Amino acid sequence: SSTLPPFLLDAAPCEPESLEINKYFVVIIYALVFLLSLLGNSLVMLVILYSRVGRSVTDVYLLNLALADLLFALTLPIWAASKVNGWIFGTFLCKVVSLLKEVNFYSGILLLACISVDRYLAIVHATRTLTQKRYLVKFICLSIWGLSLLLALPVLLFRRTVYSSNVSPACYEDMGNNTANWRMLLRILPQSFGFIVPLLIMLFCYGFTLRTLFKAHMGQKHRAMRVIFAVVLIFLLCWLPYNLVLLADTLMRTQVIQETCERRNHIDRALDATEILGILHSCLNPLIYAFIGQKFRHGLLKILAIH
Amino acid sequence: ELDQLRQEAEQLKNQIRDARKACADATLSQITNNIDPVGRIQMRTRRTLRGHLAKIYAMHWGTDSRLLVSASQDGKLIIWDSYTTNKVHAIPLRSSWVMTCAYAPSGNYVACGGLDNICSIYNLKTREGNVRVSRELAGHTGYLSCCRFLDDNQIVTSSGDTTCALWDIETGQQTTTFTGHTGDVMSLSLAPDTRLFVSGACDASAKLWDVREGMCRQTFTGHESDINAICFFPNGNAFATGSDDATCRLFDLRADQELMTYSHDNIICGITSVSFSKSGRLLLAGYDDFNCNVWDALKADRAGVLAGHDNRVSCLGVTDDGMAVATGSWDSFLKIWN
Amino acid sequence: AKELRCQCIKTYSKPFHPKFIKELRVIESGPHCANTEIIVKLSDGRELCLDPKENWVQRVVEKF
Amino acid sequence: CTLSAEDKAAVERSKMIDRNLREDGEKAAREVKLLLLGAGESGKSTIVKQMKIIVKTTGIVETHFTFKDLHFKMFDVGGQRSERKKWIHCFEGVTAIIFCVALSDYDLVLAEDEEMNRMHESMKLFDSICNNKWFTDTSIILFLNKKDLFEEKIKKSPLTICYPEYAGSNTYEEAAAYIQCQFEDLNKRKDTKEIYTHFTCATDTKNVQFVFDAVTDVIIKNNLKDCGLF
Amino acid sequence: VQLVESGGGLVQPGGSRKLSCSASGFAFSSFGMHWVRQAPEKGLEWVAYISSGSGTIYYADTVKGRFTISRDDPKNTLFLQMTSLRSEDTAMYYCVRSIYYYGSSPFDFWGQGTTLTVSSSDIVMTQATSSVPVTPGESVSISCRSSKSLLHSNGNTYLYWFLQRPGQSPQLLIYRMSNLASGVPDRFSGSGSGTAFTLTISRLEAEDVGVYYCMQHLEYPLTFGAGTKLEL
Amino acid sequence: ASIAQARKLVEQLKMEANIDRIKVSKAAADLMAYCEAHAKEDPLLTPVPASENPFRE
Ligand SMILES: CC(C)CCC[C@@H](C)[C@H]1CC[C@H]2[C@@H]3CC=C4C[C@@H](O)CC[C@]4(C)[C@H]3CC[C@]12C
Secondary structure, eight states, X not given: OOOOOOOOOOOOOOOOOGGGTTHHHHHHHHHHHHHHHHHHHHHHHHHHHTTOOOOSHHHHHHHHHHHHHHHHGGGHHHHHHHHHHOOOSOHHHHHHHHXXXXXXXXXXXXXXHHHHHHHHHTTTTSSSTTHHHHHSHHHHHHHHHHHHHHHHHHHXXXXXXXXXXXXXXXXXEOOSSOHHHHHXXXXXXXXXXXXXXXXXXXXXXXXXXXXXXXXXXXXXXXXXXXXXXXXXXXXXXXXXXXXXHHHHHHHHHHTSSOOOTTHHHHHHHHHHHHHHHHHTTTTSHHHHHTTTSHHHHHHHHHHHHHO | OHHHHHHHHHHHHHHHHHHHHHHOSSOHHHHSSSSOOOOOOOOOEEEEEOOOSSOEEEEEEOTXXXXXXXXXXXXXXEEEXXXXXXXXXXXXXXXXXXXXXXXXXXXXXXXXOOSSSOEEEEEOSOGGGOOOEEEEEOOOSSOXXXXXXXXXXXXXXXXXXXXXXXXXXXXXXXXXXXXXXXXXXXXXXXXXXXXXXXXXXSSSEEEEEESSSOOOOEEEEXXXXXXXXXXXXXXXSOEXXXXXXXXXXXXXXXXXSEEEEEOOTTOOSOEEEEEEOGGGOEEEEEESSSOXXXXXXXXXXXXXXXXXXXXXXXXXXXXXXXXXXXXEESSSOXXXXX | OOOOOOSOSOOOOOOOOXXXXXXXXXXXXXXXXXXXEEEEEOTTSOEEEOOTTSTTHHHHHHHO | OOOOTTHHHHHHHHHHHHHHHHTTHHHHTTSEEEEEOSOTTSSTTTGGGSOOOOOOOOSEEEEOOBSSSXXXXXXXXXXOOSOHHHHGGGGTTOSEEEEEEEGGGTTOOOSSSSSSOHHHHHHHHHHHHHTXXXXXXXXXXXXXXXXXXXXXXXXXXXXXXXXXXXXXXXXXXXXXXXXXXXXXXXXXXXXXXXOXXXXXXXXXXXHHHHHHHHHHHHHHHHHHHHHTOO | OEEEEEOOEEEOTTOEXXXXXXXXXXXXXXXXXXXXXXXSSSOEEEXXXXXXXXXXXXXXXXXXXXXXXXXXXXXXXXXXXXXXXXXXXXXXXXXXXXXXXXXXXXXXXXXXOEEEEEOOOOOOEEOOOOSEEOOTTSOXXXXXXXXXXXXXXTSOBOEEEEEBOSSSOOEEXXXXXXXXXXXXXXXXXXXXXXXXXXXXXXXXXXXXXXXXXXXXXXXXXXXXXXXXXXXX | OHHHHHHHHHHHHXXXXXXXXXXXXXXXXXXXXXXXXXXXXXXXXXXXXXXXXXXXX
8 A cells, every 4th residue: 555665585495406407317217227127137037936845934925025026016107207207197197107116115114114024923922922923924915915005096096197397297196185195194194104114113123133032142143134124124215215304394394394496406416316215216126135045046946057 | 715606706707798799789769779769758747646745656557547656755545536536545554654655456455655664455445445454574684675565465565674574464474485585685676477577676776576486586787886776578578667867768578688777967866766668668767866767668768847846856657558647746745657 | 306485585664666677477276275376577687476366466567 | 817716715825724824833943942962871861851841763762941021942862773874864943952961971981882082982972063064053051960079089080081182180170171161172164053061050040041041042043144244 | 434323213294303413433524414315216316515614505406495504523413404305305305425536436434324204407317227236256237328418528427326235324335436445345246338328247145135226426415226136 | 814714615616616607609699589579569669559558638
């Protein structure tokens, strides 16, 4: 209701992603982790299935973990094609592919929460409950897979391609005014149930496993502790930075973090960096779980000798 | 003195070593040069039998050439059906350590061996649907290694205290005790007329006994290490041993000496089982280098190896119609090649 | 790639001219934002986002 | 399914038979087998007189004793007066080898020859067993029994008539420890097996506790290979 | 070895009666039990079957659904419960046993038989003879023509012959074809042709009198024949 | 004593020296004659088709 030429607060929102200095490099990582996790992951497909007499509880978890890690990389170059140029097709293509990622993101972690609870039963309970792992090993593996379809059903349900100003389109998941406010609910609850539940069950079973391995005196407890201390310190390398900055914007959006245009751009520049850390979990997942022990080291060089 | 009588023995040993040389005018490999080769013999795994959970230690075909007993060291003695993979009976053993088994010519009985030197005889075609012990033939003092059946009432058991014995079954006693070895007897096999039987000992010696009287008729020392398996040429005039010298040697019973050794320079591991094929042309042999070589029995050259086993090859057997061979390994699978 | 942020963080609520500015940019509260945003700008190179809740704001995007 | 009415019932038998092997192979593989070697007079029948829960079997007598829900199985190969080279591969896959050495065999001479004392005799029996080609990944529990007889014999007769180069004093703690490390220097395989020795007495009850503590090691070490850590 | 059984008596129609077969003397859990009935003027008809370990259960067409069967392995007894019988179920019921492997002899031992009295696609087997007279000494033969080709594709012609001495319980004579059962003399000898069959008795005596049911086993329901009587 | 055990060896060796021995050239001919006159009836020498073979698949 007056005249005032003050206009100088700089409330201006910002979103620079010019000159694609991140995007040029992600396609050469996502193709490098493509061709390695096709060759170096189908070997564990081979050494389990070429022999057909290895049927212990760990001989079959490494099947489904190598199956789910391979099938994680089936969606890899398609998702790599959308990181550089945006989404390419309609609603059917991303609803099944990002279904296929999230059934494998949860099965690829819950099996690590299933190997670890088997690794506790086969060592600490080596006298009493060593029975219970072999009796239901097909039953627990399917109930882990069946759990993962349940958590990935709200991904298939809500997903369709969304267009917006100043961004190449990529599909988002809710309908309404509470689109952002309910996508936070669909984020925090299963990405904790997919992370803080396996991280609590690995640090409460590998702790009791490393309790007894420090107590019992065999010849090679110096090496078996060096793997268990490495298995947690890679699962904490790969998914703890991803689920800390995914916790960071959750605190940003509500009240806790003050919001600038360079901080959110840094969280954006952090979030894509740790999904490079999340995809390299599929890099050396067969390296540390299968190709460390003497079994597959004797398995793979067996098939090279006869062929 | 003791050396005065042993000088006669070395002279008598020099007599029979002289007589075999007076007869060997031309060996086998010089008389059958004008024969065709058998060619490559590739045999495919037609069936595979996967019931046991331990090492298969022996086997025997029934004389209907369809049924097949196999005995492993988990305390099970499963009678397979070879045409369709079925387990007819699973006989639980009293002593879990079983070093041999043998099926009846009539098809009625089956006898496990044992490391507890008791050859227990099971009854199959019985009332009440069970398989119960007919008689346990205690009386050896070592262990037991191979116990073939003459008929349903006489069983010839080799043992581990250098005594091949012949039992009765309606009564539990022995009848004869063929003694004369020095190292413990590792395998035997009966002639097709069941009048003679050979027995391969552990002092590189194989002796041809006779069933009725009970004395060694001929001895055959040609190996250097122990004789680990033995079988007959199917007319009863020749027999081939198998050793840890990796050499199947084909002897005979009317010319006293060795006719041919089946050696290859690429194989160094022992022999665990030897079985002639029908018509006596294809001497099979099962080494413990995981293979199972198939030798021609008249020329010493090889033929198609029967690879496919992930451990030792512990027992062979050709069916009595010559149809199939079955190998039992030390992983639990039997494979019925053809 | 899949990271949306609403293109408004704060709001200037001092009243000014509607004939001062040149352009308008309306964005509805659809699939990304919990509120409705309006981006205004003059040829100076300065831009701003406004809240529809105040009383003068609902007089000046309409007089413009 | 191109099968007759009886042959369809036949494979019903052969999957009921196959059910009763796979539900019995999952009962024998849960239980622990133990070979029980040693000399026949070296306190071999005494260590089965510790816990015994279970005349024709002159070859092998078993002992199906259990402890804290673990059905052990001791296989005394005593009646086998035959060649060990021919049946020792039957025991490949045993969980652990309970070896026994009477500690009073340092000065007690062998019966048949007045030479090769029974400590040196049991050492060359142990060296053939431990370095056998079938026993590599199988640990060896070693009992040193008659330790209530040894310590009052070395007071009155010296140890150095068994070992030529000892150069040590004559107490029970320092000398029996030399015999204990005399046996553990016999394996050429150092890291693929681990000898859990023990000085058991003739009257105590602690050895059955010890053999449970040394089977829980090798069961763990057999599980580290199958799970992939080792 | 015996299979004594109990139950029956007199039942009002539409009711129910539990039939028990207490089999004492063998290993029960390996024997696939059957249940064969006999109408008091007619021959034998198959009624039920339960396999080893209660796995596979077939039934006849007439008694399908209203007759239920059950096995009790530790109590060593076999139960046939009949719901809502008609007047066409009054018969003597037999509890027979059969074990099925290679070279076995099914239907070998037949129970003593209880009486059950009420109040008021399949293969057929004919037997062209009925009530032949025979003196001891003459080689008599009994024909039994089928309808389907009983020769299967593995050499077996599944035709189990039988016998029933008068009054008493039946017993096996000839399993699959020309095989003798455990404990029959060498006088009985069969010879088959796939659809036409013949049971030849070489010499016969006074204990071989009775009726001779030929029974197929090619597919369930397995139907007996109307047997031929033998007299003097 | 132990000479009595060594006395049974030489009298056993007296029995070994009395068996007649045919020549090896005739011992191998009968081994060759039986090997060829039965060669048409061996399913490992001459491989039979899957019609008359009991192991078909
Ligand atoms: C909507 C579509 C894409 C979903 C399809 C799900 C597929 C990829 C998954 C879901 C459940 C999975 C199965 C779960 C369990 C087992 C048992 C294991 O011993 C072998 C693999 C196998 C058989 C898996 C194969 C792959 C599988 C079938």
